[PDB]
Design a protein around this motif. Structure first.
Motif, mmCIF file in Angstrom:
data_model
loop_
_atom_site.group_PDB
_atom_site.id
_atom_site.type_symbol
_atom_site.label_atom_id
_atom_site.label_comp_id
_atom_site.label_asym_id
_atom_site.label_seq_id
_atom_site.Cartn_x
_atom_site.Cartn_y
_atom_site.Cartn_z
ATOM 1 N N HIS A 180 0.829 -1.202 0.000
ATOM 2 C CA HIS A 180 0.000 0.000 0.000
ATOM 3 C C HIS A 180 0.868 1.259 0.000
ATOM 4 O O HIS A 180 1.927 1.275 0.635
ATOM 5 C CB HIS A 180 -0.903 -0.010 1.235
ATOM 6 C CG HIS A 180 -1.938 1.067 1.246
ATOM 7 N ND1 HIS A 180 -1.671 2.350 1.667
ATOM 8 C CD2 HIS A 180 -3.248 1.048 0.907
ATOM 9 C CE1 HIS A 180 -2.767 3.079 1.571
ATOM 10 N NE2 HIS A 180 -3.739 2.312 1.115
ATOM 11 N N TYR A 216 2.988 4.154 6.741
ATOM 12 C CA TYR A 216 2.566 2.759 6.796
ATOM 13 C C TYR A 216 3.289 1.995 7.889
ATOM 14 O O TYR A 216 2.741 1.039 8.443
ATOM 15 C CB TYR A 216 2.817 2.097 5.446
ATOM 16 C CG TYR A 216 2.425 0.646 5.366
ATOM 17 C CD1 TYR A 216 1.100 0.274 5.240
ATOM 18 C CD2 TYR A 216 3.384 -0.349 5.405
ATOM 19 C CE1 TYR A 216 0.740 -1.049 5.159
ATOM 20 C CE2 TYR A 216 3.033 -1.673 5.327
ATOM 21 C CZ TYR A 216 1.712 -2.016 5.203
ATOM 22 O OH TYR A 216 1.363 -3.339 5.123
ATOM 23 N N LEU A 250 -6.965 2.915 7.106
ATOM 24 C CA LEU A 250 -6.309 2.345 5.931
ATOM 25 C C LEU A 250 -7.350 1.867 4.929
ATOM 26 O O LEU A 250 -8.280 1.145 5.296
ATOM 27 C CB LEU A 250 -5.407 1.177 6.326
ATOM 28 C CG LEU A 250 -4.624 0.521 5.196
ATOM 29 C CD1 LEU A 250 -3.684 1.520 4.601
ATOM 30 C CD2 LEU A 250 -3.854 -0.670 5.694
ATOM 31 N N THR A 251 -7.181 2.249 3.665
ATOM 32 C CA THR A 251 -8.191 2.033 2.638
ATOM 33 C C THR A 251 -7.492 1.721 1.319
ATOM 34 O O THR A 251 -6.392 2.213 1.062
ATOM 35 C CB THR A 251 -9.090 3.283 2.537
ATOM 36 O OG1 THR A 251 -9.691 3.530 3.810
ATOM 37 C CG2 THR A 251 -10.200 3.134 1.537
ATOM 38 N N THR A 252 -8.121 0.876 0.501
ATOM 39 C CA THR A 252 -7.644 0.613 -0.848
ATOM 40 C C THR A 252 -7.717 1.867 -1.714
ATOM 41 O O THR A 252 -8.426 2.828 -1.408
ATOM 42 C CB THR A 252 -8.473 -0.482 -1.509
ATOM 43 O OG1 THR A 252 -9.810 -0.012 -1.700
ATOM 44 C CG2 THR A 252 -8.516 -1.697 -0.629
ATOM 45 N N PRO A 284 -10.262 -3.198 2.692
ATOM 46 C CA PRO A 284 -9.151 -4.025 2.230
ATOM 47 C C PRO A 284 -9.449 -5.503 2.403
ATOM 48 O O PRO A 284 -10.462 -5.912 2.966
ATOM 49 C CB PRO A 284 -7.994 -3.589 3.126
ATOM 50 C CG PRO A 284 -8.369 -2.268 3.614
ATOM 51 C CD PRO A 284 -9.837 -2.320 3.790
ATOM 52 N N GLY A 331 -3.567 -4.696 4.579
ATOM 53 C CA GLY A 331 -3.555 -4.101 3.256
ATOM 54 C C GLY A 331 -4.521 -4.860 2.365
ATOM 55 O O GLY A 331 -5.389 -5.577 2.850
ATOM 56 N N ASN A 332 -4.344 -4.701 1.057
ATOM 57 C CA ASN A 332 -5.144 -5.422 0.070
ATOM 58 C C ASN A 332 -4.209 -6.298 -0.751
ATOM 59 O O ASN A 332 -3.446 -5.790 -1.576
ATOM 60 C CB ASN A 332 -5.915 -4.459 -0.827
ATOM 61 C CG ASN A 332 -6.989 -5.150 -1.635
ATOM 62 O OD1 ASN A 332 -7.195 -6.352 -1.514
ATOM 63 N ND2 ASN A 332 -7.676 -4.392 -2.472
ATOM 64 N N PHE A 333 -4.278 -7.608 -0.540
ATOM 65 C CA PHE A 333 -3.347 -8.538 -1.158
ATOM 66 C C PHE A 333 -4.093 -9.566 -1.994
ATOM 67 O O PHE A 333 -5.321 -9.645 -1.979
ATOM 68 C CB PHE A 333 -2.503 -9.255 -0.104
ATOM 69 C CG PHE A 333 -1.718 -8.331 0.762
ATOM 70 C CD1 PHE A 333 -0.629 -7.651 0.257
ATOM 71 C CD2 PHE A 333 -2.053 -8.164 2.091
ATOM 72 C CE1 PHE A 333 0.094 -6.798 1.055
ATOM 73 C CE2 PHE A 333 -1.332 -7.319 2.895
ATOM 74 C CZ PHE A 333 -0.257 -6.634 2.378
#
Lengths: 441, 441, 441, 441
Positions: B190, B279, B297-299, C84, C126-128
């Motif tokens: 991210h 981060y 925390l956001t995409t 996420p 996060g976004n994984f």
């Protein structure tokens, strides 16, 4: 509700208050008899499904719905089309510009009178992407140079118009006002136009101005033409000479000749050349005068305009309000509207420079990219996302409308454009009407 | 129901209890006569389809529906737009930060007074991806350094702000508190921000804070600014020296100079540098103080905000409840709401490092990635998934609303924003109204 | 129907039997006055659109619909979210296992008492994708070894838990009971777990057990933990030595040391090692005892659970049946249900081994894949299809419900979870109510 | 409404005014008893769900709806099909052409009488793309040459028909009227046909003319055949000799032999060859005579025609208007219409020349591309976008129709084509009928 809801054909049993009526075009009897001069957008078809009657003698029976009741049935259509990207029918392969001819000396750069006129270039047709159409536009200028301009005294350094997709500012050191790496960035931003003093482009009565993304703030005015004298404050900065730079390290000046002695048309100063750009004069210039007060920046549009389409059916439905009952072909009171079924789709090749470096080694010697050494006249890089049009079927429901009392055996259908002309790219048309009962009489 | 359901135009036949009314903008008569100053979001069009009347003299006939009945008809709209990602109209190319100027010595690291101020950087506009916009943000800082900071005593080791997409913790041996391979991981997590003591960033009245994915827990407060003194417990750990490590094998210390003598700003200890990261201070720090109690925390969001849009039509429909009947342009009682037709789409390039290693060899000498030897100031790696916005057409059905008794020949339409201003990126607008009968009178 | 269908505001004209009511949150007056502590999931907004009244004094007017009639209007919502993949709010970054510590000798492999305890590992957020999350799980075990296990007498051949995506059976010659090529297949089947005697994993109160695809036959029981003593009949077969095989050709035995003298824990026989696998004990074992009678095999799920969401609106609609009228925050009678707008999407990289061979050469020295010589502890290969979650907008229609007689000026909205708590990832919420007339009074 | 709305089976309780009726085909009792000769498009199924009755003795009970009321219920269908691209059932693997045989000398190019006849070529079947079908068409001509033409005096320079996807004009210098690089462009435009004097192609009663994109302006006439004498003004320009060009630089003429002495059939002039092309005679020729007045240019169509499909159900619903009540199989009054569920999909390989250069090195020695040195007879390049058909399920709602008074236990269903024949590619068919009450009696 009972009693007054019968549907008599002429000699079969009477139905009651719900049927269906099929307007197909794939009957094998209508092909040989009724429809002989017309196509899928203006055909003529039957409703009776009896097959004891050829359709010349089936144009007499009437499916008379019952009186003392107001009828009316909803409409469902299915159409399917296939039109190319660039074609002649929708004015998508024409643009006129003003390029140079007859550079001769009279009998010192205070000579050589130049001449200029308009041309109306024309490019071929097919289904192309958003980048291949740029290369086809940039070929319609050079084959004019190889015909008329080469035999006169033009020396291929002053072509004048060139469609490019770069930003000629990245790397501008504000202390010395030149580009530091000695080359422009081979990056893939929004497309623009590149002019030269004495030239211009005109997109009146065309459609390619939607493909580039150069719109206009007041889109109803008179027309759309761009000259050299509108791009003020948008000169491309000159390129620093790096091979004559390392004499200071055992000094700084612009570069003028590039391996074949083509002049960059560097001005009296040592800062910028004589090429003006649209994208560089839109945001690095003045937000009050010139451009940014007259046009607008827009993403690319491959299908180049989404136009509406009108269904007409002048033997079954009654006329809507404020329509004249006529039998001229180009009036035909409209029963429903839709959108033309041509969409867009993105693909993300992501390489776009190695896939351009390698493409002109196994497929293309020098047919495109004729000048692979001059930095301004080089081939533009392809974007990291590419967009191609596509054709899909369309399923629509148009609601209810009142219909007539007696329905003839033969019926007309018509599918028109926004300027009342039949679209030739319609491949299949199909409708279903289902009558119901409304208020009494 | 009979009798009181006629629809008289003025001189044609009376209809009964169902018609359609087309609000098109592509008539060739309105372009030359009525609409001359306005565009597709605020145009003015006719309803009569008679063509015995120019639209200046067709603004007198009234399509009067029958009285002693309450009428009302449903609405269907078709709109189609094309706006870029980064533009000036929706505040998407502005952010202000606080960077350094004028490092001079007074007349020992107990000297060199530093100064700081705010700037409001501005980046160009177009349609970009989620990674190319990061590189355009990271160019708006360096061209300030090449203008003001280079002529003073700044030595390009203390820039201050740098947008990165890595995790500066992977490889942290807890026994020696240093990173073992002597290099940070070139991986693509991210995105965050990287600060330096005396700097900060401010995203008030901007929209790029939705692109990064740094939200706020209470989104209604006052504004949104991030300083160096909020990122406590988030220092980047120092990098172990491996070329001065093999003397133990025929000992351990941080690295300070990298091939050009750029200082990493290593502190008095031998554990960590003086760079703080967002981060790394969000989850490796304290879940009570600093951050993780203040942000979220956001995409990533490429379209950067999904705003609503209001249809207005103040000559046909009656006013909804709690609306004042006015003719000022920016009130115009709303007849329906939708969403702005700008979506997102993922593509999965999957290489993202070889496609970055090879991209800056055939297209980009050193214009981006100006410092290709310092590990902190290196170019951030691209994610394994990339997201690009796109524009689609929108087909909507808004239900029924009551309409007036007499309808004038000329009609207004209006398509506004959430802050009551016309969106300039509307290319096509189109509506169909179909009246029915409601309760009696 | 006439007479008793008026809608009086207080002082405007009375409407008749159809309006619309807009529940927006983007008003610029509510931001400064009403909503100051709360966010987009629990905001407080107005209905009057009059702008002669600040919303503190607009909380008094009542839009009283007419009595002697039962009213009620349908509901349409538009919500848009961005959460996420891995986060703390939905319990998606926790799993506890039991690994080894303190291997010391008492004062011959009849010594070295081993110890074991539980840990509750935690991985970042996060976004994984579905494969990068496996590498993040497999890093939360090794950084425990580098902290506690390395300082005691553990020799990194008996870690204990390792998440792998292979099948350790392909190439099993049934005559000699060993794998013929001397290496395991680097192929990409369903993921499993790899144990070692004395270890185990526990997925109680977590959500990562849906990502792997290891479900349970009775999903309501008590919890979900897997020990070494459940995987009977699932030992990995030992690997044949091929470099000590060509002495027969100028003889057959298992391999024990691999270039660094790491023991494979080969048993007293010469057939199989002491590693048990889940995927190999599910179908090559016993379909009655152990596993295959207790769990189930399922494809991967990146979004890890599709939960429902509840809309509440306790100032306009009446309460549904069997609901108590309350003003506590976490009861709030529900007016409609939906699904959480988080989908999945497949991409098909198709290489997955060359793209793994080349990825750890330009981006990753040895941070992942710490042991690139041991065949069991090697990095798992990536699947030929990869799946990533995504967020889309949701357009829903919830049907009709009866509403109250008098509507206050200020209104509450609330969007909850399945366990009655506000979801913090809601970015936009929007509703439209359109009242109609029902039965009389 | 009360009283007259009961639904009596024979001996169960009477329902009231809403049921459902399931027309499934996956019952395990109908497979062994009723349906033994027929398939999924013409099966025979039961409605009673009682399982105290084998379906031979369940063909007697009548589900008699109540009289003194008109009934009728809406229909919902679910069908799912799988047909290939090229098959025999829809006339998609046949085309006839006229190629050459028996070139012998009588007893100077004023000899060698040539002969010609028609053949009706046939190509294999399967599911192919838009480019692989071109290679299969171009193999059905050469295997005629290897059978009949090789044993006579044909010398493989005058084959006659060849399907190509290039533009043989790019690089045409108008001063010397020859192609400058000495090779044609290996680019991937719209496909066309290439003729030779004495040949022709006929697409009557075929379907491959929709795959190429060569339509006809009046699509109802008699048939569709293209001879050599229609392509006037479309000769391919001759190719300049470049290896005999550098003698001028220590002169210009066409090339005739290429490394194996194959003649290009160069005419008496030195400008153009004797090969005519369709694409080059459509836009570089005359827009009044020949072609461009007779055909039309269209994008490719992989599914090759979207035909309609008819549902029939002659034991439950009543007959629609103008239909005869019959029990012949190929009349069966139609209850609803749809579209055949075969779509198209684009993929964008983007390389298409390196992926063709490398494909015939690891997979294909010389089976395709038999003549890899002659420029006209070389393999055509693949487009940058490729299109493949696909099969999706179809969920449809056909509205209401009146149904009979008494419903028999066994029921027929039938799914036909546009020419009244059962489609053999239907895999699943499924319907649900839900009766309601209409007007009284």
């Amino acid at each position: 509700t009972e009693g007054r809801n019968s549907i008599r054909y002429s000699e079969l049993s009477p139905l009651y208050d719900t049927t269906k009526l099929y307007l197909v075009d794939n009957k094998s009897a209508d092909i040989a008899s009724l429809n002989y001069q017309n196509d899928h957008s203006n055909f003529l078809t039957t409703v009776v499904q009896n097959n004891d009657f050829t359709p010349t003698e089936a144009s007499t029976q009437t499916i008379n719905f019952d009186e003392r009741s107001r009828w009316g049935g909803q409409l469902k259509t299915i159409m399917h089309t296939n039109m190319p990207n660039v074609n002649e029918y929708m004015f998508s392969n024409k643009f006129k510009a003003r390029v140079m001819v007859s550079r001769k000396a009279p009998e010192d750069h205070k000579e050589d009178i130049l001449k200029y006129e308009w041309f109306e270039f024309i490019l071929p047709e097919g289904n192309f992407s958003a980048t291949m159409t740029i290369d086809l536009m940039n070929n319609a200028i050079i084959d004019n140079y190889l015909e008329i301009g080469r035999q006169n005294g033009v020396l291929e350094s002053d072509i004048g118009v060139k469609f490019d997709t770069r930003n000629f500012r990245l790397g501008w050191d504000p202390e010395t006002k030149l580009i530091m790496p000695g080359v422009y960035t081979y990056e893939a931003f929004h497309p623009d136009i590149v002019l030269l003093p004495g030239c211009g482009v005109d997109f009146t009565e065309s459609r390619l101005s939607n493909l580039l993304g150069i719109r206009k703030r007041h889109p109803f005015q008179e027309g759309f033409k761009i000259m050299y004298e509108d791009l003020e404050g948008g000169n491309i900065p000159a390129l620093l000479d790096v091979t004559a730079y390392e004499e200071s390290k055992k000094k700084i000046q612009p570069l003028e000749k590039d391996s074949k002695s083509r002049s960059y048309n560097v001005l009296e100063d040592k800062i910028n050349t004589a090429y003006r750009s649209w994208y560089l004069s839109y945001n690095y210039g003045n937000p009050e005068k010139g451009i940014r007060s007259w046009t607008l920046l827009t993403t690319s549009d491959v299908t180049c305009g989404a136009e509406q389409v009108y269904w007409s059916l002048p033997d079954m439905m009654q006329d809507p309000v404020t329509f004249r009952s006529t039998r001229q072909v180009n009036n035909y009171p409209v029963v429903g509207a839709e959108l033309m079924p041509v969409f867009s789709k993105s693909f993300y090749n992501e390489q776009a420079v190695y896939s351009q470096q390698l493409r002109q080694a196994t497929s293309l010697t020098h047919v495109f990219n004729r000048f692979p050494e001059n930095q301004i006249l080089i081939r533009p890089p392809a974007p990291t996302i590419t967009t191609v049009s596509e054709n899909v079927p369309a399923l629509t429901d148009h609601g209810t409308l009142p219909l007539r009392s007696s329905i003839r055996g033969v019926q007309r259908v018509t599918v028109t454009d926004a300027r009342r002309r039949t679209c030739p790219y319609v491949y299949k048309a199909l409708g279903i009407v289902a009558p119901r009962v409304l208020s009494s009489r």
